[PDB]
Design a protein around this ligand. Sequence first.
Ligand SMILES: N[C@@H](CCC(=O)N[C@@H](CS[As](SC[C@H](NC(=O)CC[C@H](N)C(=O)O)C(=O)NCC(=O)O)c1ccccc1)C(=O)NCC(=O)O)C(=O)O
Ligand SMILES: N[C@@H](CCC(=O)N[C@@H](CS[As](SC[C@H](NC(=O)CC[C@H](N)C(=O)O)C(=O)NCC(=O)O)c1ccccc1)C(=O)NCC(=O)O)C(=O)O
Ligand SMILES: [Ca+2]
Ligand SMILES: [Ca+2]
Lengths: 210, 209
Amino acid sequence: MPPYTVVYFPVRGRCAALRMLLADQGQSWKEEVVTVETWQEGSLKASCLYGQLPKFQDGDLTLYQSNTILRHLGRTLGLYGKDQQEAALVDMVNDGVEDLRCKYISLIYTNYEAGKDDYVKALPGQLKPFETLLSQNQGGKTFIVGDQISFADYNLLDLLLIHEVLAPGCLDAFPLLSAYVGRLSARPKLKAFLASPEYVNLPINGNGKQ
Amino acid sequence: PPYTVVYFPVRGRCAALRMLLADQGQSWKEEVVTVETWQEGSLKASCLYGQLPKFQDGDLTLYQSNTILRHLGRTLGLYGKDQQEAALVDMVNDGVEDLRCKYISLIYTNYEAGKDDYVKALPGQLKPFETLLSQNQGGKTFIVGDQISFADYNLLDLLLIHEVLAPGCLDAFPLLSAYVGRLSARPKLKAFLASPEYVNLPINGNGKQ
Ligand SMILES: N[C@@H](CCC(=O)N[C@@H](CS[As](SC[C@H](NC(=O)CC[C@H](N)C(=O)O)C(=O)NCC(=O)O)c1ccccc1)C(=O)NCC(=O)O)C(=O)O
Ligand SMILES: N[C@@H](CCC(=O)N[C@@H](CS[As](SC[C@H](NC(=O)CC[C@H](N)C(=O)O)C(=O)NCC(=O)O)c1ccccc1)C(=O)NCC(=O)O)C(=O)O
Ligand SMILES: [Ca+2]
Ligand SMILES: [Ca+2]
């Protein structure tokens, strides 16, 4: 059997980036799907460390927390910078991505109708830092940190993709981010994954909003 | 090194990294930024995400409180003994961060109407850290493994600010209670926690705690 298992709801959500990472690195994994019905039964939830999914298994190592999973795969597959300084910058990018992801999640699940206009107005100022990081790394022609891909690239890519669904054209203001999405999305194993039913037939979020 | 911490005159998201630096015998410079200096706009515009803390380690400039914690963890060997422990350290820290975000939302956004619900939910929010202790050498050492990690300083801070918010919140948790006592008694950390530089700073920026 595969050494990796992803336990999650039938949504892209906080597993999208880590799935992209695994597919792009040609790793095999099992998807264990938890229905809302099963979740409401309560036993699985009670057994989860923080009462939430995703849960991830790497052999007998059981992890919770989407960013913990990303960092763990980053470490074990060599997607965490070439040295200690690049590692810090990778973290800095990922923490920025997480901060914006949390704002996105708050919009989607708690305030979509009343909040979308303001959110979209504020969006360029929230995306700009990633454009700046790109502009300061080899003119934005490679990755978000250094000259090799990192877990932060996959997470940032996911963040950009869902924001283009939320606010079509939002990357027209950001030439380097725009080209970056194109480039990464064209990586053959990733392109194939992103076009596959496994990805395409899951909704982005759990409540029908995007 | 040497290190510079750039932040507002509060404990906030720098408290844990300060505890770490002091406990580890490191020296650093505090650059205090006043609310007045921030409102001018220039420093803020130079910050990657328009926010503090900002941190300098020689020629390296970092933003993001957990990035700074992880960098110190990595460079000072406070990140577990191997990749497996490193993942566990991250898992703890990410749990600490989630609860810290809820705390921050309460304090700054909804203190008066939200505190009652927050406090009632608190035991179930703290229990995971007691369980983690229970599963690691009977709770007698650190949150992960046999050596201190950056996640211990972050968890310690989280627990200390929660005992201010809800006195007695650790009483039902013997391992966490004992852990806070043990860590707080480490000599350099004890000295730091007793010092004016810690005690005379407010926890948060808005008078609430
Ligand atoms: N008391 C809960 C409130 C309920 C809640 O979970 N709200 C969500 C948006 S619902 As979605 S993602 C599934 C969710 N897992 C996480 O939030 C993990 C966060 C962690 N930091 C990480 O990065 O891994 C979950 O497990 N919910 C179940 C539960 O808590 O009972 C969804 C909905 C329906 C079907 C499929 C998927 C929220 O706002 N989360 C915050 C965030 O994701 O940043 C509480 O305390 O949050
Ligand atoms: N819409 C704004 C809201 C403004 C805001 O910052 N709210 C705070 C609570 S105020 As405090 S802590 C200083 C703060 N830095 C961060 O939030 C960094 C987050 C990062 N993930 C990390 O971990 O480092 C900041 O720089 N604020 C200034 C600014 O943004 O211009 C304080 C107040 C007064 C005096 C001293 C200290 C908030 O809710 N932050 C989120 C969090 O900490 O999780 C927005 O976009 O945030
Ligand atoms: Ca000074
Ligand atoms: Ca050590």
